[PDB]
Structures are given as C-alpha cells and as structure tokens.
Design an enzyme around this catalytic site. Sequence first.
Site: not given
Length: 330
Positions: A35, A199
């Site tokens: 994770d 992004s």
Amino acid sequence: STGSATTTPIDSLDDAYITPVQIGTPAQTLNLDFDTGSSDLWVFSSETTASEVDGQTIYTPSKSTTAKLLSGATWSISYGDGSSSSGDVYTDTVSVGGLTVTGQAVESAKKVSSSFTEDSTIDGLLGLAFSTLNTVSPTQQKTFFDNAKASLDSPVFTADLGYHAPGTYNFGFIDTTAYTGSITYTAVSTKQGFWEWTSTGYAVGSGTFKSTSIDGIADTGTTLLYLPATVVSAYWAQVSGAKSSSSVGGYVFPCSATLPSFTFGVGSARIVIPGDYIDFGPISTGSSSCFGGIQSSAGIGINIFGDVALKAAFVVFNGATTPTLGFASK
C-alpha cells in the site's frame, strides 16, 4: 541488494493485489496488500480476536525465534475506506522476494474492522508511503522500504500491476524490459506523507486532451481512480446510460456498455487506461447495472490515482534524497 516478488489480484475484479512476505524465523509467509498510501506493516496474528479471523493466515510471534516485543508500543490505523485495525508491535525479520530487513516493525493486530475479517485473501498490509505517517506510538516506526533503502542498489521500488493477471513489485532496480518507451519522472510533495504529484490533464477516449493540473496520490492500496467531479462527469457522459447513483454511492453504467479509455498526463507524457479497466462489474449479484472504476473525489479531499490508473503503467517510486515518481506505458 534487490528484491522482486509477484503480486496477484485477489479476485476477478482486481479489487486489490496481494504479495507474499516472509516474516520471522522460521519464515511465516503472509500475503500482504502493498500500500503506497499508508506506512504501517500490520498483520493478522495469533493475538487477533478470534471472531475477527475468518480464513486469513496469521503471524504467531511466539513461534519466531527472532521476534521481540517492542515494549510499550501500540498502533491504530483508520483507512479512507472506513476500515481500521489496531494492536501491539514486534520487531522481526521481514523478507520480500529475496530482500531482507532485520528489525522491521511488524504490527500485530489485536482488532480488525469487519471489512478485513470479511476478506479472507488479505493477511495484512505492507505500507510503502512515507514513514512520517506510521501510526506506532509512542515511538514512530519505519517502513520496510525505508529500512531497506540504504542497502538497495538504487533507492527505488517499482509497481507493475496486472489487469486480470499477475504483476511485479521490484525493490532496488528498474527492469528496463518491463515498459515501452521512456519513463517520465514528475515532482513529489511529501508534506502529507504520500506519493503526491500533479497530473497535467486528461482525455476521454479519442477526445481532446484537456490541460489541467490534477493533484493526487499514487496509491496502490486504493482500487479505483478518484478524480474531480468535472473530470468524472466528462468521462461518464460518454457512456450511454451511465449516471451517478446516490444509493449505490457513485457512477453506475449498463453492463452491456463498451467503455471508452481514459488518458492521464504525466508531464508531456500520456498514460492510457483501457476502457475495460474501468468496469467493476454488477453492483449486486445478478444485476445488469455495473459499478464504474472512475469515481468522484469530491467527498475525499484528495484525488487518488489508485489501481485502475497505476495498473496501466510501470510506476517508479524513487526514494532519492528528493523523491520523485516515474510513469511509463507498458
């Protein structure tokens, strides 16, 4: 040193990925959920309340000759999905696919919430976010990657998750045969303890690419792609019959639909998620309404590039002095 292990989807929907981890002496192998969104290595154990164990493999510290109780240390974690666990702490030897850390904090669960009990395929979590998020009190502990870093050939680990298929976590090296083209690296903020990046935009299917900064985290421990409501509405508008369902808790679409792809920007590079990666199947057994893999982050407070996004890419988690994130197509 290096290490390499195969990671496998837990079910037919790629709901999560498990990777085998050796703990203790002699080795006890547990299948953990790696994770990059959390920083605790915690396991089902001989200490877990018996009614909360339903099929998982347990760690028994009393059978490990290298286990030592970490005196006075406890841990308690709550995840964004509403699940939780807590317990005490041992140090023990932990190995992933040939790579060994001695003295790793192994957080032994005394209590797990119902979703963990209900999932017999996940024996615990191996956190790979920044050690500042580790929950052990009163002395915070280091992640497996943080402990291994100095010994690795390069201070990096890579995530290569498969769509409906096995994939690989590598530590200490970049497999230049595992991706096509080049790896584009992008800046990371560690201020929240996550692999947080920006992004450069998105496209839906064959549509026009929209340049827009999307801040979010690269999170192998989250199944889906959570993005701003404007972006998610633009995606699902291209699917006839899709709509947001308040009772289901997000966008659903007719199971007979063929989904468009979704592209996200990494610098000037582009990662294309095939439409099939966005299909999470019937909302309930036998339904013809299916659950979407791209969902709004509006109630979260952060965008999450989870497994739907990351499995479309070969992802480099660069733990250099200034960490960065690398994405390549594959």
